[PDB]
Ligand binder design. Structure first.
Ligand SMILES: CCc1c2c(nn1C)[C@@H](CCN1CCOCC1)OCCCCn1c(C(=O)O)c(CCCOc3cccc4cc(F)ccc34)c3ccc(Cl)c-2c31
Ligand SMILES: OC[C@H]1O[C@H](O[C@H]2[C@H](O)[C@@H](O)[C@@H](O)O[C@@H]2CO)[C@H](O)[C@@H](O)[C@@H]1O
Ligand SMILES: [Mg+2]
Length: 518
């Protein structure tokens, strides 16, 4: 449960150039005597937050930048403080992708976007539109081939099509996100996912196709096209398929919009090797020779280092990567990105398999993506109005009827719980000795341990939130009102992390209102 001093452990995904990264590690070891271990665990982006929360895990984690905001919000990443001379060596927009709440929380490595990859011997002119792919598949099936195979198990690969006609994750306008404006179940998202499901229904695609199946079929020449990123080009090179990399097809006349990732390297906040890690990343990896070693193993895409990016910029495959990137959007790094991806992953799999209709699947994904912010709105408002005696006048915003009605239900049932359970609430408020902001941050572990043991139902959720209001009242009297919002965030985090699937099954806070109706 403690990271070892005097070595570096690095985690990177198994589709990236980890043997090349290990070569950089060997060069580090030659200068310093410090051994560098590169590992590629399964589901490392899910494992890192669990093990790092205990003070364990790798010294350095590599992932696309979208997951790092969550890690940073949880206190799991060291702040990065490169000097100006180093910062100036990387493109400013890559640093922007690894900024969270004003601080740099990772080193950017390379810019990744999906492209259409096609077999020039089968398909001299790849299709410009998604709509022409069914007819192309029919032509190719008559030749013992198929038009298109790509990974249908990870929503990253289907998102460019879902977004094309108007789907979006979190709305971006006037230089900032509106986290409460989620675009997963609108008409444009439905149109794109319906087109995907229709491709499967019409036998142009198979719902069970995953990364390995699609890669094998393309690299053996059975399918004329795939959708993948730069890391995949190495294995196609080895297959000697005559391939090209080009712009994704349009849908309803609009570009496919891939979510653009910046592969990034974060330092574990619990690492006793932060100076070594910074030395490795700045003076070994993020150099022309270090990125070359990784890129020669599995291509990185458009690297963040200006000097080496210019050296590779003439590669037509990189130009296509950046053309598709310009038509897409840089992913947010907000902490709810993990929940968004989990919700949309399930929606695509369920729609593709027929377990849910497109309408059902996207509705559930919308609820899952909105769950944190909607829960916080309700919980923060209830705690604050209970503590101060006066309600928040600010508009509820999106799903404001749901929030207003849930808050109204909570006012009824939560005030009764606080009345009837004053005895236990007073007793618990003594055992916990909450005096300051530091005491509040300590509550999450006891909260999780009590709340995640036993039956799940709305009554216990009312008890969780009602005791929160009881504590908010206390915080107000000891002149610690500024601790109420952090407390509300902590309660919300416990609720939505421990009860995500159950909450979505109940239709979220709409199920709460109907459970307690009349
Ligand atoms: C129902 C009220 C109640 C409870 C207790 N007894 N009784 C009668 C305490 C024993 C009480 N003894 C202990 C010895 O000093 C005399 C009283 O143990 C039983 C645990 C089950 C009942 N249960 C539940 C529940 O998950 O069901 C909760 C919500 C989950 C845990 O939330 C929190 C825990 C800790 C800090 C929190 C701070 C917050 F800001 C918000 C939630 C917090 C819950 C929350 C508070 C209480 Cl008091 C009870 C709860
Ligand atoms: O599928 C959801 C998934 O999308 C992205 O992960 C990409 C990753 O950025 C690429 O580097 C490559 O490894 O493929 C992954 C998809 O399998 C998000 O970065 C990730 O957080 C998200 O879960
Ligand atoms: Mg592995």
């Amino acid at each position: 449960g403690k990271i070892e001093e005097g070595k570096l452990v690095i985690w990177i995904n198994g589709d990236k150039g980890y043997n090349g990264l290990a070569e950089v590690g060997k060069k580090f070891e030659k200068d310093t005597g410090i051994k560098v271990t590169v590992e590629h665990p399964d589901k490392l982006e899910e494992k890192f937050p669990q093990v790092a929360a205990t003070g364990d895990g790798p010294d350095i984690i590599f992932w696309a930048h979208d997951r790092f905001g969550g890690y940073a919000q949880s206190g799991l990443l060291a702040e990065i403080t490169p000097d100006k001379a180093f910062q100036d060596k990387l493109y400013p927009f890559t640093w922007d992708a690894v900024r969270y709440n004003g601080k740099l929380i990772a080193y950017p490595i390379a810019v990744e976007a999906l492209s259409l990859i096609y077999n020039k011997d089968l398909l001299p002119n790849p299709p410009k539109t998604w709509e022409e792919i069914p007819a192309l598949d029919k032509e190719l099936k008559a030749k013992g081939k198929s038009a298109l195979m790509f990974n249908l198990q990870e929503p990253y690969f289907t998102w460019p099509l879902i977004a094309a006609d108007g789907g979006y994750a979190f709305k971006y306008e006037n230089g900032k996100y509106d986290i409460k404006d989620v675009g997963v179940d609108n008409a444009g998202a439905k149109a794109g996912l319906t087109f995907l499901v229709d491709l499967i229904k019409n036998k142009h695609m198979n719902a069970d196709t995953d990364y390995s199946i699609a890669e094998a079929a393309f690299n053996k020449g059975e399918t004329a096209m795939t959708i993948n990123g730069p890391w995949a080009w190495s294995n196609i090179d080895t297959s000697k398929v005559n391939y090209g990399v080009t712009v994704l097809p349009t849908f309803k006349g609009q570009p496919s919009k891939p979510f653009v990732g910046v592969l990034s390297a974060g330092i574990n906040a619990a690492s006793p090797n932060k100076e070594l890690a910074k030395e490795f990343l700045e003076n070994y990896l993020l150099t022309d020779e270090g990125l070359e070693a990784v890129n020669k193993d599995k291509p990185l895409g458009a690297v963040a280092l200006k000097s080496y990016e210019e050296e590779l910029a003439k590669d037509p495959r990189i130009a296509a990567t950046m053309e598709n990137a310009q038509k897409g959007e840089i992913m947010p790094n907000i902490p709810q990105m993990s929940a968004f991806w989990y919700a949309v992953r399930t929606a695509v799999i369920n729609a593709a398999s027929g377990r849910q209709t497109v309408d059902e699947a996207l509705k559930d994904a919308q609820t899952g993506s909105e769950l944190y912010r909607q829960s916080l709105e309700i919980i923060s408002r209830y705690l604050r109005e209970q503590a101060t005696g006066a309600a928040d006048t600010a508009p509820m915003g999106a799903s404001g009827a749901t929030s207003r009605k849930a808050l109204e239900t909570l006012r009824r049932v939560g005030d009764g719980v606080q009345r009837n359970h004053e005895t236990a609430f007073q007793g618990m408020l003594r055992k916990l000795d909450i005096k300051n902001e530091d005491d509040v941050k300590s509550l999450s572990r006891v909260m999780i341990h009590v709340f995640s043991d036993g039956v799940t139902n709305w009554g216990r959720i009312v008890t969780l939130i009602s005791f929160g209001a009881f504590v908010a009242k206390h915080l107000k009297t000891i002149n610690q009102e500024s601790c109420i919002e952090p407390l509300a965030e902590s309660i919300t985090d416990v609720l939505v992390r421990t009860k995500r699937d159950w909450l979505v099954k109940q239709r979220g806070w709409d199920g709460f209102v109907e459970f307690f109706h009349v």
